[PDB]
Assembly symmetry: D2
Homo-oligomer: 370 residues x 4
């Protein structure tokens, strides 16, 4: 019982996406088949398209999907046709990390999210000529009008929420907001600095406001992002080309910030931000540089300051509870991540990729045809 889809396909390293007819098989096991309404586009999709992470091509990418369950496998227990879902990253659900509530550190994370196929090497998508299309990208491959996900990464959300907006809660927004709320455990009355005011950093700024922080510092080089950060809840905005960011943060906070989040991936920014921590302060790291990149820290500064540096994957959340919390906060007017979004038709995916790379659009969302 296969069915026709329209998909954006990456066929060559660094080449534009092609919009193509394809076919997807029926769900098996505890998979759900999702009619995809809209999917966020991320720099991470483009990094895979460029083969810096060489997921085998031709491939259907996309890892910020939102849609409606159309069919369920025989093992699905908790989703039903008609449910609205946000598609998040894959996890195995049975390893020690998954079992402890930390699926972000699943032993099988890279196989399930970057493998290009299921554990048997099979794909669920075929192209117009019947050839396999590498898929299972973040256990969803949601750059297509239909997607398969496992029940545990298809997150039910209230039907009254505006579904086409919600796909980026499956990755980038959960990463920034979860880094603040869960990993760093930012709380009432603390100071927080976001190094980077892209979609992840803005999500962190907004999350720190929700969590009760009284000083919320956005650091970037783009004046319009700094202006937007102030509108989204930051108390201070620092242009790092114009001041010494370490000295500036020390002035604002009286000696250094309680919590910081590095989302640029630039090791010089990371090394500098660690110096901006205050007594017992904690830097969380979510931006990834090229493999092999090192950062340095001053040992005595870390020691005498009681400083912490912590790596964070995907916001280290429990998505099935955390994504609906973010939806509710948004519905309450407390989490305006719609301000990060521009919508595009799937057909315009290459323009959205360009706008993502140029920074003109913090979070493109592609609307799928049906």
């Amino acid at each position: 019982d296969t069915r026709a889809v329209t998909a954006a396909v990456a066929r060559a390293a660094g080449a534009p996406f092609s919009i193509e007819p394809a076919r997807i098989r029926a769900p098996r096991g505890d998979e759900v088949l999702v009619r995809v309404v809209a999917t966020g586009l991320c720099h991470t999709d483009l990094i895979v398209r460029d083969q810096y992470y060489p997921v085998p091509l031709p491939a259907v990418l996309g890892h910020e999907g939102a849609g409606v369950v159309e069919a369920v496998g025989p093992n699905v227990k908790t989703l039903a046709a008609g449910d609205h879902v946000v598609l998040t990253y894959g996890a195995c659900g049975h390893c020690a990390s998954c079992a402890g509530g930390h699926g972000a550190y699943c032993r099988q994370f890279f196989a399930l999210n970057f493998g290009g196929a299921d554990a048997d090497g099979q794909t669920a998508l075929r192209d117009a000529a019947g050839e396999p299309l590498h898929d299972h990208f973040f256990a969803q491959s949601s750059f297509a009008s239909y997607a398969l996900a496992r029940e545990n990464n298809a997150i039910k959300v209230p039907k009254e929420a505006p579904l086409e907006l919600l796909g980026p809660l499956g990755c980038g927004i959960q990463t920034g907001a979860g880094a603040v709320i869960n990993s760093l455990a930012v709380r009432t009355g603390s100071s927080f600095a976001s190094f980077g005011a892209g979609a992840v950093g803005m999500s962190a700024v907004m999350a720190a406001r929700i969590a009760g922080a009284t000083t919320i510092i956005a650091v970037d080089i783009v004046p319009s992002r700094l202006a937007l950060a102030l509108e989204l809840g930051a108390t201070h905005a620092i242009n790092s080309k114009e001041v010494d960011v370490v000295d500036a943060i020390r002035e604002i906070t009286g000696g250094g910030v309680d919590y910081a989040l590095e989302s640029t991936g630039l090791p010089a920014v990371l090394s500098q931000g660690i110096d901006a921590l205050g007594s017992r302060g904690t830097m969380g790291v979510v931006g990834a540089p090229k493999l092999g990149t090192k950062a340095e820290f001053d040992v005595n500064s870390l020691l005498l300051g009681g400083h912490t540096i912590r790596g964070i994957v995907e916001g280290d959340s429990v998505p099935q509870t955390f994504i609906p919390q973010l939806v509710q906060l948004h519905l309450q007017g407390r989490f305006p991540f719609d301000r990060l979004v521009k919508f595009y038709p799937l057909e315009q995916i290459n323009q959205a990729a360009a706008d993502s790379s140029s920074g003109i659009t913090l979070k493109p969302i592609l609307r799928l045809p049906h």
Copy 2:
């Protein structure tokens, strides 16, 4: 009401200590005057003697004192003459860090512990000719037969404990044991690696056994320290000159250790030990290199592993509760830190310094004359 003391005096950078008569004034305010029974000697005393940290000379050092309260200032509330006390580091007791239970990060730490005088620039000790001797070293200057401490760093311990053994609980042993129990929060069933098997590292090994760790790895280059570590509770001992320590720890733990403590101060050891962390593992840092020393970490390894690096001062404990817990564990036969100790008369301080520097003695304790 001044009184005569015998003191070890550092008069010149890098020069041997001289044993000299001196005089100490009566306690004021909330000071207690302590008849010092025995004091640990630390590399940190020798680093100050060598003026790498230039506490003004001539100075009376010593920061691991144990003794009997002989007199109290008029503001002392909770100590009385005859009480047995361990002398720990100074803290102001009124800053935000002190008020939160984290005196190790007191805003006034360096003034109170390394200033060489009280806040008015006055010393409580004078030499035989009546000249000031810089003092207040770790709020005690316990290389002398009598010492002044404030009530909040004179820690009451049970009179049935063997008092002459207990002074090192005021610094090095509390640092290693507190790093494990408090900062890292090592708990039942976890894996722990000590990088360094000096007095601090051995204390950490013993503390990890108390706290319930099931894999306890001692890393050093001295075979006799590794042999001793196995006797004191380590499950594994690694000679880092003989194996790749990162690979060896990964083998023992199935991928990396939950908790690690760096006490050598060697930045290459620190950078290497951070690589040995397992998923969501935490490296604690207590060994201090020369100021300005940097260490590096692989950003993606820290990020993808959810690794934490944390600086730790003095074991980040509450000494008035933690030191008596360590005494009780010792009395119960569960904390054999006596195995680190060799006793020397104060007159032999320079031989104890030599044995500390050569590594022949993990923890010299100097017995004071009276």
Copy 3:
């Protein structure tokens, strides 16, 4: 160097306060002398006036003072004349609980706050005829135009804050807000119910909104308090005379609330509220019934639900950091506790007491003459 004050004096059990001239001595030790601008009035003052807690009479009560430091004792380290301070409860600062950052559980709490005199049995206030007036009430006795406090319960606040509003941050508002932020650790996306919408409960409602709770339920019997609670950040208001509160909370939250705070002191309300907890939910208890009062719980409900019941004193905060956080949140427009307040001249203290007892005024603040 004594000085004249105007004080409200409780001379007889249950009798109206009398406004009287008095004299206060100069500060000693680490006391500060505060020119009191305005002081909150609490039911707790009236309970002592009524001698249910028999603080010896004649007595000057008041434990929510705000004012300006006028003089300091010779041991004061961190306050200076001209500083704006909120006066909170007394703690000894040297016991194990104080040393761990939990002065709310100070071993000397009742002596320091309810003793009626200092530890030597001496009062700092004398009446017009020169007789002692029992004082040191919550280490302040701030129903007077001047008050003595110790440095550790005189909390510096920014001079730009409206000082006359801030005294209730020293007790009732810190109790409600700290119970939520610190003891219960309410966090983003959780559900919270306040049993009681007096000043403490309203503070808890406002604090839960600051901390990120997405369901915030106010429970009371007074329609105007429920209406006000919705304006101050509650998502739901329940009149417990009109619905079954347990069933109603279960409906709103899908099975029970994550966090609850009991501030009425009514044991039937407490026992009922514990039933309203959801899976792994926690009830915090701040309202005190008469001594000897018991509450009951269903053992299997607590066991099978993983429920927690926790007693909370004074919001279990670190006041010197927490009170300035609440001031900053108020200045940012995020903590509108001014909506609880009505101002009265000290001369009208008995009318404010009446309005407190009748519930007409949630938090009277008395303005002091000078």
Copy 4:
């Protein structure tokens, strides 16, 4: 592909078990078929046999199984034939509680553990005449020579461990040890009291010793259990018929215990034990009285003491990590729970039930025939 088993069957309320031939079907889905070596017997089995919890009869009970995987369903990912497993309680693995690492509070706990059948109402066991035998008891029904369990409650353990001893780690021993290590988070230097010295209480005593507690108090009425508790790591033993337990604990601990665990299920013991808590102390509750049973607490004592009361199910652990930690501690000589055990052949199940009820045997283990 069904296969023959020998099973202990409960056919009538309160009646002796009957040993009977039966047949079990092949595993499906993510089930594993286990050749059961030995199974603990619990009062909880007898409570179901007596129909106080009316699991439908005829039924095969047993919920402390240990055995060897003989066959796997097609969805099993992480177990293979030949693996040694301890069988613990069932959880769904996909609800919010499971997803957060708290399967003890699974939304489906009672269906999965007390339903008497799978979710379709089907049993996997049939008796000699072919009639259904109610099963799936704690997702195992391990009073039989073969058992079906789901992969997520079949916990792999090292093959070198003595397998026949390990079944009680699947319930009673994990409950006592996990209550101490996980729920209460007993840590180095704390005081702990076990109310009850049955198998659960003894496990808690042993776990508190592992976790570093320096005062470990066993409370019971049976002198031989108190004597055994001292041998297994308790520092103090209290016969509650001979002293006032509250006063005695207050004397031993200097005012009350940091942590307590109630395992008798007697509400008078619970209410009394809550009074024995010290400042900021926590009582954990694992013993279950009859449904509808209430306990009381003094509100002011709980409030002024900052006391906590917490319900605990199954030790609130992650069994796949916690059970192997307990096995390792046992192999290291640090967890001597073999001292609780007496072995019996399955044929003697009714004598083991009698010895359990009389208290003569703390933890019977039944050896299965094959």
